[PDB]
């Protein structure tokens with residue numbers, strides 16, 4: 320049997336579990352299935368990347384562009400102000416999903432309108448990322464390393480920017496063949512200059528939609544009936560809605576902000592909540608027992 324009490328990673332003060340016996344059972348199920356049955360479905364910004372480091376806020380993939388040298392100061396001020404205004408709505412504990420939804424759509428429209436006007440060149444994304452302050456969570460090498468060693472499918476489902484995200488994991492040496500990225504990917508003109516975004520918008524509250532539009536990916540992993548889902552938002556809880564068959568699913572949520580106001584809700588909807596946690600130690604220990 321699995322005993323969380325015997326696992327010190329689980330007894331750290333940042334680990335909040337509402338139903339420990341159910342988490343035990345779920346983890347026992349993952350262990351029984353092993354590699355052969357495991358897949359990972361994970362958010363990106365503030366789930367695989369850090370929310371803050373040494374007391375300062377770390378950038379999302381969008382923030383990497385907001386802050387980079389390829390954007391004029393005037394634009395950056397506009398972008399900072401949209402961020403202040405729209406982040407406040409995104410995390411607002413008082414507002415329902417349906418109240419927030421149209422403001423999230425609007426944030427993306429305005430942000431992405433301004434980025435297109437700046438004409439970001441594809442060829443500069445590498446430098447922009449290398450000069451950025453982005454940080455992946457502690458333990459990211461062993462997370463991706465262990466998954467790739469056992470050929471475990473990893474689906475990264477991000478409402479961020481796909482090109483930037485890929486470049487971050489590429490520079491960190493963890494963009495392995497088992498990793499699939501679904502995000503908002505830049506459309507470039509004939510000069511390799513940004514003119515728009517491809518496909519349909521993925522935002523904070525419509526991951527259900529793109530989950531169902533990837534049933535090709537999911538129907539090839541029908542045997543991968545044991546799922547570990549990681550997210551930091553309530554909208555991430557929908558990322559596994561396109562999975563073919565679910566036998567055991569464990570949901571791990573990073574609660575990074577408005578902790579006291581959001582804790583009960585997070586504990587009710589995620590199996591394990593990780594409060595102001597900048598490492599992947601908990602999921603790494605699960606992987607260590609499973610693979």
Ligand SMILES: Cc1cn([C@H]2C[C@H](O)[C@@H](COP(=O)(O)O)O2)c(=O)[nH]c1=O
Pocket residue numbers: 362363364365379380381382402426427430476477478479523
């Ligand atoms: C549109 C926009 C979104 N974002 C955030 C909103 C979400 O929290 C996050 C989406 O990435 P995620 O789905 O990987 O967490 O990006 C910005 O930081 N800046 C922006 O301009």
Ligand SMILES: [Mg+2]
Pocket residue numbers: 362363364365366550551552
């Ligand atoms: Mg996120």
